[PDB]
Write a protein that binds this ligand. Structure first.
Ligand SMILES: [Cl-]
Lengths: 398, 398
């Protein structure tokens, strides 16, 4: 067998379709091996360092691999190695990537409609940003549509509970599109239609944002996204026309969620807890959720609980519709100070509201919200329906 | 080729990285074979009977297998064979498991963040509990977090329509956590943060419970869970802080769903039909859904229909919010006797209620609910809005 791709490049096939065995990609590693088939005439093909290897006399060895690629095929070593380049080659390869293990990277870009990534769990199959890297661990570029990101973790320096972060990092960024193509869904140039699903992905341990979807991107679907341990903002969205189902964000130093300039969004099933988490040392108050400058939002079946300051702050927003909403036991950083929903120059229709303050119910004495609603201005038009005061006994008269 | 792993254990390599072909795991079967590679220095590697095989001389043979394991790698035979140990070895292996076929098991435990399981369908790829086994077919242990269970069946004795059950069986049990770790998500000891996803899993044919999530577990997500043919209770949950989407439970001898001591839960999209199923012979009335001793629940877009007794019984519960609810044509075991929603010492806000009783509409004469609402106590605080009486013609004056 050939002992490495370096030797494969020095091995000329003598017959078309010739089978060769590659022991491993890189000498002494036993990783990334496989069977390859030769094309004597290799014009048209480009060496990519893992599934198309070209020889000195211009043949192409083709890896026999019907479906997805994995970083080991392109030279990844796992462990403490920097696997950025092999991961980047996978997503650029022309096929979906499967993550089979944990791989350190610095920054990765998804560019094509083939740049899907699949794992097998929210922890063990993962990309992990190297400690000295800054910026976005994964960026979805405006040329990338119709992909799936499914069942893997995106972890940063602070991923483990109670640990410190690398400044200036983001887990997944969706960049603002710079143009509009006219050949969707076959486009290869900038286009606003992301039309992609992020499903069962776990983001943890970044500084600025877990997930940050910038303005101008349509139909970024999330489903069962799980974000935790973010030094600042768990999830930011600044765009229009999307649906998220079953989002969960937990333990953020500032907001769990920022909606800023959003429109025509749906959130269906969500849990935002432990925002403004005091050990993360953020200076100042931030709510569990900011809804700012937004409009035509439908937010159903969410909960905001155990946040250090206000629950939900709705500001300068029109036509916010919420149906089934649980906010309780926020204001945890100073007792009897903060409120579960704060309205400022906004209009909202809230139905199915509940909010049993479990600290008042148990009589624990733990810090909790002074009450459910605060109006910071008198020009809001708001309706609220539901169980505004729960009706438990009141062991501590509150 | 080596004829069996037993032979492989008696085959010393004489060159590091040496390739060997294994025809099959166990003699005669033609299953579980593949290519392996030698480590002459075996130490620090443990025989696991499918992917790491140690020789009498201390070398390790390592299966060439980048991604998921399957039970056939570890000696499973399929068909009528008890594959419990092969399947247990997979979920213990350090990688996710793929089920490629139906395997009989007695009882499996999921213990690690690597213990994911994937199939390719809600039926053909499955675990099937042996008629000789009792207890939990799958137990998720309190050390197991961040896994995915996706697209496979979990079947017991009664899975086929109209068949009998083995006493004392449960499909999937999530045990009560015995401790709290301080290094999530990298924990290896008990923790309440399950943070896992059960997606497109079909549970059928168990005695006591299809799915039973015990108290103290956070964020067990379910997505497109299908439970049917359960002798007693389709799904029981007794915990807090979770979301389920598109749950369907069909044909249970007692309740389709028990929420007992739940809080801060969301169910979005659900159908619970044919509870208190008379052929399963249970003694007594059980509702489609029991909500007992619960609080701060948001339950949107569900349907309870065709159940033998009451539709939904809400008892000793605070702050139950329901937005979009369909209950009709329950009480099928005795005409004109049972009610679609029964309130007992509970508070609730129900919006977007509908309940066209299709049997009264068609004039079939089939047994159905006496009416939509019954109050067993007068200390309830309840708001109900929607279409309380549908307004069809009334062929039989009802
Ligand atoms: Cl909804």
């Amino acid at each position: 067998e050939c002992h490495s791709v370096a030797d494969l490049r020095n091995t000329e096939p003598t017959m078309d379709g010739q089978r060769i065995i590659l022991k491993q990609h890189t000498a002494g590693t036993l990783l990334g091996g496989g069977v390859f088939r030769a094309l004597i005439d290799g014009t048209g093909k480009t060496d990519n360092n893992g599934t198309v290897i070209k020889t000195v006399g211009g043949a192409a060895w083709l890896r026999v691999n019907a479906d997805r690629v994995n970083p080991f095929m392109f030279g990844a070593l796992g462990g403490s190695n920097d696997d950025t380049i092999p991961v980047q080659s996978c997503v650029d390869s022309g096929k979906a990537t499967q993550l089979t293990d944990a791989h350190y990277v610095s920054n990765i870009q998804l560019k094509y409609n083939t740049s899907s990534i699949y794992g097998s769990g929210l922890h063990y199959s993962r990309l992990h940003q190297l400690p000295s890297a800054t910026g976005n661990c994964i960026t979805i570029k405006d040329t990338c549509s119709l992909i799936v990101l499914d069942a893997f973790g995106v972890y940063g320096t602070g991923a483990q509970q109670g640990t410190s972060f690398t400044a200036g990092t983001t887990g997944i960024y969706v960049e603002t599109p710079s143009g509009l193509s006219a050949d969707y869904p076959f486009h290869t140039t900038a286009d606003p239609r992301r039309d992609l699903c992020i499903s069962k992905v776990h983001i943890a341990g970044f500084d600025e944002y877990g997930l940050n979807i910038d303005s101008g991107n349509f139909s970024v679907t999330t489903d069962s996204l799980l974000v935790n341990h973010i030094n600042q903002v768990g999830v930011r969205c600044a765009t229009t026309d999307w649906t998220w189902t079953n989002i969960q964000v937990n333990t953020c130093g500032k907001q769990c969620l920022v909606l800023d300039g959003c429109g025509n969004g749906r959130i269906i099933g969500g849990k935002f807890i432990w925002a403004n988490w005091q050990p993360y040392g953020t200076v100042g108050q931030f709510p569990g959720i900011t809804i700012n400058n937004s409009q035509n939002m439908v937010i159903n079946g969410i909960e905001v609980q155990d946040c250090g300051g206000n629950g939900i702050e709705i500001s300068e927003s029109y036509s916010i519709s919420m149906n089934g909403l649980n906010t309780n036991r926020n204001g945890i950083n100073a007792n009897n100070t903060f409120y579960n929903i704060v309205f400022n120059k906004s209009d909202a229709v809230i139905n199915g509201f509940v909010g049993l303050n479990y600290a008042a119910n148990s009589g624990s004495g733990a810090n909790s919200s002074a009450g459910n609603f605060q109006f910071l201005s008198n020009d809001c038009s708001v309706t609220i329906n539901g169980v505004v005061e729960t009706g438990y006994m009141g062991i501590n008269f509150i």
